[PDB]
Amino acid sequence: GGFRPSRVVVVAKTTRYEFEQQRYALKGSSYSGLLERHHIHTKNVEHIIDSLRNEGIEVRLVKRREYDEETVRWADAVIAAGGDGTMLLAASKVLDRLKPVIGVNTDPERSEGHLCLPVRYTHSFPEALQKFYRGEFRWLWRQRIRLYLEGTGINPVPVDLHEASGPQLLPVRALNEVFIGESLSSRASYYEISVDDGPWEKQKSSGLNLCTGTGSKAWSFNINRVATQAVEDVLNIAKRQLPLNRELVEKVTNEYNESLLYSPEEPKILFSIREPIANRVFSSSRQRCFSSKVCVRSRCWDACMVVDGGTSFEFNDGAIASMMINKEDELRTVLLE
Amino acid sequence: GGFRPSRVVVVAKTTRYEFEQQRYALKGSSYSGLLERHHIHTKNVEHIIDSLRNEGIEVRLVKRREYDEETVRWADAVIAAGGDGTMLLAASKVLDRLKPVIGVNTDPERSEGHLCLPVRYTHSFPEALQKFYRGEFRWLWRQRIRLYLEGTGINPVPVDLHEASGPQLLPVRALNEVFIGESLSSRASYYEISVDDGPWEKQKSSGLNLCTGTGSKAWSFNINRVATQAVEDVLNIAKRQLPLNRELVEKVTNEYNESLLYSPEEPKILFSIREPIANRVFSSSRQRCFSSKVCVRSRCWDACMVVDGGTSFEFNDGAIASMMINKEDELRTVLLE
Ligand SMILES: NC(=O)c1ccc[n+]([C@@H]2O[C@H](COP(=O)([O-])OP(=O)(O)OC[C@H]3O[C@@H](n4cnc5c(N)ncnc54)[C@H](OP(=O)(O)O)[C@@H]3O)[C@@H](O)[C@H]2O)c1
């Protein structure tokens, strides 16, 4: 049950310093902080490449603009070298459930890397390669959401945010989430939603978030999690309208918040109405729920459907989107100690 | 203590139908629904104008593009004829704490009108005029936020969303709120905030909301309010880790949520971090709090400071904004039964 690829594409993030270069000594604030960050990431990319080549593996190192589907098909395995952002980028071009995608955190002090290998492998990559070769790991297939688009006036062409018609399959899958909303941050969004083929219900809010189990810890977590002060208050209306302290409040906050996370393997969508407006003229139903399918009718003026923060689609009045989870969209990942 | 103005400007909202006209029978969905809405609003505007003129009051009726500061100064009183959106529009051009601004809800079935006179006066406007003339009302001065801008690379020119340097006063006041965030809905916002001259703390989130007491019921309410299911859950961790029902859950939800609203007369800012990202690489302090002053240092790429959903200012890395509450920005409104 081992695993040793012969061909690997590494797709490495572009650093802020590289960004500033491709755009023009100490300008404003974090001047040489950018250069320190750049050297850490570069050191780590070289460690990964050297380790692979030392195992006899043929490696091709690309940035964003040269990470393409052709390079993915050439490779036996994709390695994202950066942070969770780099894993989303890499996963966006993999649509084959058998193709391994592995993430290495190249700046652990500034990159969370929740989708990447544990931090120790960043500077101990031959060790990870040995664990793979020896089968000392397990496969984790992360469920992903796929998007269909139909209706009138639709435009299914994807837009890369990093620079009547029947249902058509959009060319990207969501590993984290589909966000839906007006482009203007302060403009309320208006749509109708049907969950698991239920009746259509109108909604006014600041958007909709539809996440996977993998995405349950990302945007969705910060949309729905309850502040420890909010439960201090809520538990105080309780005794007014058991004793409390920092102990009990922290216990109840974390149980509630853990209830927002679910397994990346579970094929269900966590769907949240983001900041709904109720009041005396509009009304809203549930705020969050699980489902296997949610369809959205756009009633918006200048709105987008945004996949993993990276790929955007037009979604204006007349457009109808269907999200669901399909086994062939499972993203093949690894789990190490 | 009566009140009868001689000159009045009425600023009336533009209807969707007027919008469609100024842009070109039954196109898509709500076809003649737009025309029904248009006739209701027009009927009501005529009732207001006829009532005023029947009291001997000279009236000038304007839409958005002709509501200007000159017309405001000509008038003894401004009347916004539409919904809360129209009140925000009208208030945006009044900077004199002595100048009355009155809102009439011209479509009560579709307009909340929380800033407007009670719905009965929409078709009983001579009655409101008599109550004013007789002193059968009270004045309500609603506190507003003012914005200063300083730093490097700043651009203080306002942008109408409806189509090194020392601190300079921005030309609009917030009756509802100042929103601050990246323009791209899915891009995390990065800034430093100082509350009541406290130490600077970095923050990563989906933006900041800074509202008045008037704005406490608007965006801020939907940013912070707790769902009745979330307290059902929270009260269930409580008994596990008094009896519950629909009764007790609704009682505790509404006490908690009422704690988010405060008097429009109170001169303090309710400040919320909108969807903060904590995790193992960033950290956040309080989520919401009251204050008299909050200063924000922009660390953003393409961000805006948006006042009452209507006026937008550039706010990118190097810009520094100061918000506070000043008595001369009080907005003079009326309260009737
Ligand atoms: N207010 C919010 O919570 C908010 C706003 C916008 C986007 N997001 C999330 O950020 C995603 C895009 O990430 P990005 O790296 O391109 O931009 P980003 O601004 O760097 O993402 C914000 C942080 O979330 C972390 N993250 C990403 N995916 C995660 C996951 N599945 N579980 C736990 N944490 C995760 C990122 O990890 P790294 O540090 O390793 O990059 C980063 O620390 C989006 O799909 C969305 O979920 C959240």
Ligand SMILES: NC(=O)c1ccc[n+]([C@@H]2O[C@H](COP(=O)([O-])OP(=O)(O)OC[C@H]3O[C@@H](n4cnc5c(N)ncnc54)[C@H](OP(=O)(O)O)[C@@H]3O)[C@@H](O)[C@H]2O)c1
């Ligand atoms: N997710 C959200 O909650 C969200 C998102 C964007 C904006 N907003 C709020 O909407 C304001 C702009 O309003 P808009 O009419 O131009 O666009 P809008 O989309 O029509 O406003 C949304 C609703 O809030 C109501 N509202 C406005 N001010 C209020 C207040 N002080 N207290 C209670 N309710 C209020 C509006 O009343 P009417 O029906 O009479 O118009 C409307 O029903 C912004 O300042 C912001 O506060 C809220």
Ligand SMILES: [Fe+3]
């Ligand atoms: Fe990132």
Ligand SMILES: [Fe+3]
């Ligand atoms: Fe409105």
